[PDB]
Amino acid sequence: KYDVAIIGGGVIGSSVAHFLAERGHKVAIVEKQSIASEASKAAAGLLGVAYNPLFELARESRAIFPQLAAVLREKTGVDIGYEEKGIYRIAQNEDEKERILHIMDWQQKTGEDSYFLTGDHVREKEPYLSESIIGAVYYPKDGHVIAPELTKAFAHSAAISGADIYEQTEVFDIRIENNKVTGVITSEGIVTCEKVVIAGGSWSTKLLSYFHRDWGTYPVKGEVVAVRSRKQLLKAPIFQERFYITPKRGGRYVIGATMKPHTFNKTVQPESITSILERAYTILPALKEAEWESTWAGLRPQSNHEAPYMGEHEEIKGLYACTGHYRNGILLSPISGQYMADLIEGKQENHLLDSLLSRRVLE
């Protein structure tokens, strides 16, 4: 008999598990496979990168990462790979240069420090980078983490604090008896609880029907490649119109990512492998003579409302939702967990439904 059962053991559900259990709530994670089985183990873990109410949530989440990391390491033994060596936006042609200069110029007015670099000035800092790069924007405060490690950290933190983790357990439905959540119906039987959180990434749609038929998430498949190198090829991640090359602990380079909407398919097509690597060669040619390590596919949970659903059901008491983070669920995992636990404890109002899901279209 739990305070909250959490449906899904990705970063988002594990983050929620962490913050609740930390505050003495008896919590259960129910996950149909394993912790970090899906988007959260496929993600490149980049933090930061137009305006909107997410930008501010992101900024708030971003700032939690330094202390969160230290805490998690100390408590669980897992280091999440938090790194802050900055991130480059690169440009290889003039359209791209201007696109980047314009982003920077609106960004700068918000207080975020960033410097425009010349191709030669980039190459002083990152010498393996292509002669084709003509400029770039450097953000010294950006960084990244190891998505699966952060995920695993949250979940074991939760367990240490008393959370029960049920892997290989699928939630078919929520048990609402008198317009109240009384439990959850799983493949391994009933789990009694007083509150539920839907954190089912790309699979949340059916359970989101309790809120509304049109509420939902769908998978946007992304394929990525990883290579190893004995050279110091990149110090910091490089970005180019969503495409990225990122270092990780241990001389690993992670490179992606394709976009294939509305499929749960986790195979990798050759063409994607070829397309990804050829693009990487124009940025960073030495990757030709690196060591192939792996390739994989992950399922970004797009929102039907183009913003994650984070909130309490207005009628059915104890029924919560927290999914649809799409491309920024690693970045936002800390703010999401913190918020959800505040909301579950009555410490915050149910205002993030309103704020994130309505967009004024006219006027």
Ligand X SMILES: Cc1cc2nc3c(=O)[nH]c(=O)nc-3n(C[C@H](O)[C@H](O)[C@H](O)COP(=O)(O)OP(=O)(O)OC[C@H]3O[C@@H](n4cnc5c(N)ncnc54)[C@H](O)[C@@H]3O)c2cc1C
Part in contact with ligand X (CB under 6 A); list of ranges 20-28, 37-45, 110-118, 226-234:
37-45
Site string for ligand X, 221-240 (x = CB under 6 A): -x-x----------------
Residue 278 CB-density burial (10 A; 0-12 exposed, 13-18 middle, 19+ buried): exposed
Q: List the one residue out of 259, 220, 257, 253 whose CA is nearest residue 237.
A: 253
Task: Choose the one of ligand X, a copy of itself, none that binds residue 10, judging by a C-beta under 5 to 8 angstroms depending on kind.
Answer: ligand X
Task: Choose the one of a copy of itself, ligand X, none that binds residue 37, judging by a C-beta under 5 to 8 angstroms depending on kind.
Answer: ligand X
CB of 184 to ligand X, least distance (A): 8
Task: Choose the one of a copy of itself, ligand X, none that binds residue 8, judging by a C-beta under 5 to 8 angstroms depending on kind.
Answer: ligand X
Q: Where are the beta strands (DSSP E) in 229-354?
A: 238-240, 243-248, 252-256, 260-261, 291-303, 309-312, 319-323
Give the number of other Cβ atoms within 10 Å of residue 235's Cβ.
Answer: 14
- Return the residue of 27, 44, 165, 197 that touches ligand X, per CB under 6 A: 44
Q: Following DSSP, what letter does each residue of 157-175 receive, concatenated? A: HHHHTT-EEE-S--EEEEE
Q: Is 9 in the site for a copy of itself (CB under 8 A)?
A: no
Q: Are 140 and 237 in contact (CB under 8 A)?
A: no
CB of 250 to a copy of itself, least distance (A): 6
Whole-angstrom Cα distance, residue 222 to residue 193? 35
User: How many residues contact ligand X, by CB under 6 A?
Assistant: 43
**Which of 97/195 has CB closer to ligand X?**
195
**Which of 86/301 has CB closer to ligand X?**
301
Site string for ligand X, 323-342 (x = CB under 6 A): x-xxxxxxx-----------
Q: Is 7 in the site for ligand X (CB under 6 A)?
A: yes
- Return the residue of 18, 25, 32, 248 that touches ligand X, per CB under 6 A: 32
Q: Is 302 in the site for ligand X (CB under 6 A)?
A: no
**Which of 65/326 has CB closer to a copy of itself?**
65
The one-letter code for the residue type at 166 is Y
**Which of 224/344 has CB closer to ligand X?**
224
Enumerate residues 24-83 that contact a copy of itself by CB under 8 A: 73, 76-79, 81, 83
Residue 51 CB-density burial (10 A; 0-12 exposed, 13-18 middle, 19+ buried): exposed
For the chain, breaks with the C atom over 2.5 A from the next N come after: 49
Q: Is 135 in the site for ligand X (CB under 6 A)?
A: no
Q: Is 117 in the site for ligand X (CB under 6 A)?
A: no
Structure tokens at 358: 């309505």
Q: Is 81 in the site for ligand X (CB under 6 A)?
A: no
Tell me the torsion sign for CA atoms 227, 230, 233, 238.
positive
Q: Where are the beta strands (DSSP E) in 199-352?
A: 217-228, 238-240, 243-248, 252-256, 260-261, 291-303, 309-312, 319-323
- Residue 105 CA, chain-centre distance (Å), reads 26
Q: List the one residue out of 293, 95, 113, 299 whose CA is nearest residue 200.
A: 299
46 known ligand binder: yes
Site string for a copy of itself, 240-259 (x = CB under 8 A): --------xxxx--------
**Between the CA atoms of 185, 187, 190 and 195, what dihedral angle is there, to the nearest 10 degrees?**
-50
- Return the residue of 17, 133, 165, 310 that touches a copy of itself, per CB under 8 A: 165
Whole-angstrom Cα distance, residue 171 to residue 190? 9
Residues contributing to the annotated binding site for FAD: 11-12, 31, 39-40, 44, 46, 171, 326, 329-331
Which residues of the chain form contacts with ligand X (CB under 6 A)? 7-13, 30-33, 37-40, 42-46, 147, 170-171, 199-203, 222, 224, 256-257, 298, 300-301, 323, 325-331
